[PDB]
Amino acid sequence: TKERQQKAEAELKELEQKHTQLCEEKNLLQEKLQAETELYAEAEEMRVR
Amino acid sequence: ERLFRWILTRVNKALDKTKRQGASFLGILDIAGFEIFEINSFEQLCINYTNEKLQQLFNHTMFILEQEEYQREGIEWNFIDFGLDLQPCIELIERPTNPPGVLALLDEECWFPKATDTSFVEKLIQEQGNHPKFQKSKQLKDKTEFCILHYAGKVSYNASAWLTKNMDPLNDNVTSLLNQSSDKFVADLWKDVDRIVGLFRTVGQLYKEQLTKLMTTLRNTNPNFVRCIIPNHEKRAGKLDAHLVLEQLRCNGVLEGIRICRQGFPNRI
Amino acid sequence: SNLEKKQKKFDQMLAEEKNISSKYADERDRAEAEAREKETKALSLARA
């Protein structure tokens, strides 16, 4: 039971960290990427103009 | 302002997950009151314009909506106009495509590479000049001041530092430094240094846009009004002016409001 | 005022007969209650 807890509780901290730097930081980077895409679309529009 | 915004965010954090989206929410609006000061700066004009805008909203929803719903349902009803509208008194502030309103004029004046409050007053008096709700300065047009009529009376305004009070430039270096200050709370207070000008979009456009957003959200809701009238500027109990409350309930258009239900049909089914 | 008056008049027009029938039914119910009381008192005397 104890080694399975450590197989789960030390897995739960893995879930927490991978969610804060792989799912939450993922969303932050997603916002950054959307901003970059929109600003580059504006840049290319200004380019052709 | 950043402190106030953080306080507002924290109090909105009363509940978010527990704030499961309901279906019959309730809206409550309490606005700044119409004020007449010896010096009414730009912000005074903003709040008084908001007052006028919501008063026009009430007048519309109170007379127009009803009179047009009558004919729209084919009921026998002559359109009984009551001569109550602030449509020009509101158009004169914002209308961009025609001769620009006060907001658009101020935007193109502050975005000018080099201008002055007096230059802005000149651009205004040459732009509208003859608008009924507008009246140029009392022989002191060079004094960068000007008065406007409103649904509560005529109030003056001094354009002193109006372009600065709109643009609001800040030292970018100190903002960046404070963004990286030791304390974490001040970092939270200064973790959104994105468009703070120090050399894009100023406060007029944001304010009018979000106000229009509020009004759009509100008009999609069956409203309900209650109005409050001051006894007197005495700030004292007991006494109560006569002509004051007279003109107050007059400009509020309450008698014709009563006349509506006295003559109209305020029920729908 | 005229609408209120006409409503009151049209109501009373039928309310006359309504109250007549109501008084009739009330008298009938009172007589029935009196008869039931008499029967209950007879049963009470028998039981006593």
Partner: protein
């Protein structure tokens, strides 16, 4: 006999300045000129015809429903409003909406028995109260299955803003659910007390003394109260707008700025006063117009109030 007395159209209102509109009797009429005489004093002066303000039958005095007056005269409505005010009846119904005139005195019209005797009943079933219009809003929002809204206007706020927090106090207890757990007396919940304190919490800021008013919303505010399908509070939201930055940094002529500063002056702990390196009045360039004694209020009291809130 007074009925037949003022039945003649010669006992009617009249414009003036001593009270704006008074009541005057009339002897006779010449063409379009009415022989107006002041029944109050004796001032007899003929006036034009356009001054037709019928003095409504005094049997309808102090009526709270102006939507039933036989004669909708400007003088008549000012009259009725004045007497309802002097009779301590601030809230007054009128057609589709209501009118309130804050008398700057705390009228004891806030009690749980008032809540109950005003909850549930329809509009005209009870005397005009802000609790009643709130209850009507509640019944409408639960009836139509769609949202509702209420608004307040005015010029200064000390009465044009107090009504909003009064409605808040009402709604915090009229529709609070029970998950176990005079005036607002009820087994409150967490969110109830928290939303009640939400008003003074933020109003510690955005509240300053003007040359006209001493305390009110120095900005625009909008409150959103979500609800469930069984009519219960499920979420609160606040929306605030531009602040008085001028007063915040440079106070106006003899005007008290955001009360939070004066509260901090003599509300904090001398320990924390020195720990924040502070000082009293007459020690700040930003203290234009210096310090003013706020009428009938103290700083430390509301300071501790806001802290606990």
């Amino acid at each position: 006999l007074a009925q037949a007395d003022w039945s003649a159209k010669k006992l009617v209102w009249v414009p003036s300045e001593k009270h704006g509109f008074e009541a005057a009797s009339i002897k006779e009429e010449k063409g379009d000129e009415v022989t107006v005489e002041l029944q109050e004093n004796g001032k007899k002066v003929t006036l034009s015809k356009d001054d037709i303000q019928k003095m409504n039958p005094p049997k309808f005095s102090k009526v709270e429903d102006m939507a039933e007056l036989t004669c909708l005269n400007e003088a008549s409505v000012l009259h009725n409003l004045r007497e309802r005010y002097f009779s301590g009846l601030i809230y007054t119904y009128s057609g589709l909406f209501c009118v309130v005139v804050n008398p700057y005195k705390q009228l004891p019209i806030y009690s749980e028995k008032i809540i109950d005797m005003y909850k549930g009943k329809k509009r005209h079933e009870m005397p005009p109260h802000i609790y009643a219009i709130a209850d009507t809003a509640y019944r409408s929002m639960l009836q139509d299955r769609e949202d509702q809204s209420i608004l307040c206007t005015g010029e200064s706020g000390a009465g044009k803003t107090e009504n909003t927090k009064k409605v808040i106090q009402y709604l915090a207890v009229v529709a609070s659910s029970h998950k176990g757990k005079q005036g607002p007396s009820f087994s409150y919940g967490e969110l109830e007390k928290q939303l009640l304190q939400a008003n003074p919490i933020l109003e510690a800021f955005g509240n300053a003394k003007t040359v006209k008013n001493d305390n009110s919303s120095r900005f625009g505010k909008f409150i959103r109260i979500n609800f469930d399908v069984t009519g219960y509070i499920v979420g609160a939201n606040i929306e605030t707008y531009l602040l008085e930055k001028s007063r915040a940094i440079r106070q106006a002529k003899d005007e008290r700025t955001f009360h939070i500063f004066y509260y901090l002056i003599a509300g904090a702990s001398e320990q924390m006063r020195n720990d924040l390196l502070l000082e009293g009045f007459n020690n700040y360039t930003f203290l234009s117009n210096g310090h003013v004694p706020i009428p009938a209020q103290q700083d430390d009291e509301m300071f501790q109030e806001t802290l606990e809130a």
